[PDB]
Amino acid sequence: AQNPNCNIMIFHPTKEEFNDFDKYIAYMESQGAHRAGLAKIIPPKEWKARETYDNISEILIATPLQQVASGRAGVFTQYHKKKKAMTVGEYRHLANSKKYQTPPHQNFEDLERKYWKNRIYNSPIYGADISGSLFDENTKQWNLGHLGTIQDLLEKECGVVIEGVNTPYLYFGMWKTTFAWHTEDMDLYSINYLHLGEPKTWYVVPPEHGQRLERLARELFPGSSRGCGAFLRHKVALISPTVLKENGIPFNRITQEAGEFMVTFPYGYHAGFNHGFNCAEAINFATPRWIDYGKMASQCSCGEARVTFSMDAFVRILQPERYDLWKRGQD
Ligand SMILES: O=C(O)CNC(=O)C(=O)O
Ligand SMILES: [Mg+2]
Ligand code: NI
Ligand SMILES: [Zn+2]
């Protein structure tokens, strides 16, 4: 078995290998990359996502989210308080202000220490989940707005045509902005490109050990666990590396820098934080190997998780017994 310790793998495709996205995903899996739950892909040196980022300041962040924490430093939840709209140029200035800017630090490890020590005492503002793309239309390789759609994959594999669309999302971050422990909707893959700015640190649990994380989360967030049998679908809970190590949960960590892709694999739990002002783009995708994960994915039916239009068909076709209850949660 390839990669039996489930380490995060890093790949350096040539320009020739960068032509066929599906084939390269299947290659990475042949080498065991999926066992980690996360892989890094460094694009060939000849490749670029677009010519410059000089003209992005007028993009609107309609609903910036202030991420307010409750709990203890290593075990906390976050809620999102909606703020007034602001442009990317306004948000960048805010991120660079004395109140919100990255503190002095020695290296990524010192910054990670300061994040875990101090996150809960501040409420950073995240411009998350903005529909759109920063890839130039002329970029033909690994352009996240030009991927094969998950609806077309389901149709190719299963023969059933379904409604729905699949488009990318932009994330504008600042120091301490945080993504909570989650898997993707319907345990899909994700791909994330860091367009510009400061790094993003990731933590990941191997898919084969995901249920270990779930059992710890039920112990650590006991009211949330009684409220919902899949409460990590709410995307609000954080658990530090120190706490994971104390409870014997297998995980790995890696820092993504500007110009790099990350791929998360089906049922790979992940969480992380931004080091400073940055912009990422991400989208879900599927392969044939995903279908069985989609059929087994947990679902939130308590009403909190509330998701896209396109998840309806995936539930209806892959999980018909769950459909009725899940849809009640969505309505
Ligand atoms: O970058 C973020 O805030 C969160 N991204 C992801 O969870 C992803 O790409 O799967
Ligand atoms: Mg602009
Ligand atoms: Ni994700
Ligand atoms: Zn729920």
From Swiss-Prot:
Residues reported in the UniProt entry to bind Fe cation: 182, 184, 270
GO cellular component: blood microparticle; chromatin; nucleoplasm; nucleus; pericentric heterochromatin; site of double-strand break
Biological processes, Gene Ontology terms: cellular response to ionizing radiation; chromatin remodeling; double-strand break repair via homologous recombination; inflammatory response; positive regulation of chromatin binding; positive regulation of double-strand break repair via nonhomologous end joining; regulation of gene expression; regulation of protein phosphorylation
All copies of domain JmjN, residue ranges: 8-50
Keyword tags: ADP-ribosylation, Chromatin regulator, Dioxygenase, Iron, Metal-binding, Nucleus, Oxidoreductase, Transcription, Transcription regulation, Ubl conjugation, Zinc
EC class (word): oxidoreductase
Cysteine pairs bridged by disulfides in the record: none
Ranges of residues in domain JmjC: 136-302
Cofactor: Fe(2+)
Modified residues annotated as PolyADP-ribosyl glutamic acid in this record: 16-17
Cofactor note: Binds 1 Fe(2+) ion per subunit.
Post-translational modification: Ubiquitinated via 'Lys-63'-linked ubiquitin chains. Deubiquitinated by USP14 with the help of TRIM14 leading to stabilization.
Catalytic reactions on record: N(6),N(6),N(6)-trimethyl-L-lysyl(9)-[histone H3] + 2 2-oxoglutarate + 2 O2 = N(6)-methyl-L-lysyl(9)-[histone H3] + 2 formaldehyde + 2 succinate + 2 CO2
Annotated binding of 2-oxoglutarate, by residue: 126, 192, 200, 235
One GO MF term attached to the UniProt entry: damaged DNA binding
Cell compartment(s), UniProt: Nucleus
Binding residues for Zn(2+): 228, 234, 300, 302
EC number: 1.14.11.66
Similarity section: Belongs to the JHDM3 histone demethylase family.
Role description: Histone demethylase that specifically demethylates 'Lys-9' of histone H3, thereby playing a central role in histone code. Does not demethylate histone H3 'Lys-4', H3 'Lys-27', H3 'Lys-36' nor H4 'Lys-20'. Demethylates both di- and trimethylated H3 'Lys-9' residue, while it has no activity on monomethylated residues. Demethylation of Lys residue generates formaldehyde and succinate.
UniProt-recorded name of the protein: Lysine-specific demethylase 4D
Species of provenance: Homo sapiens
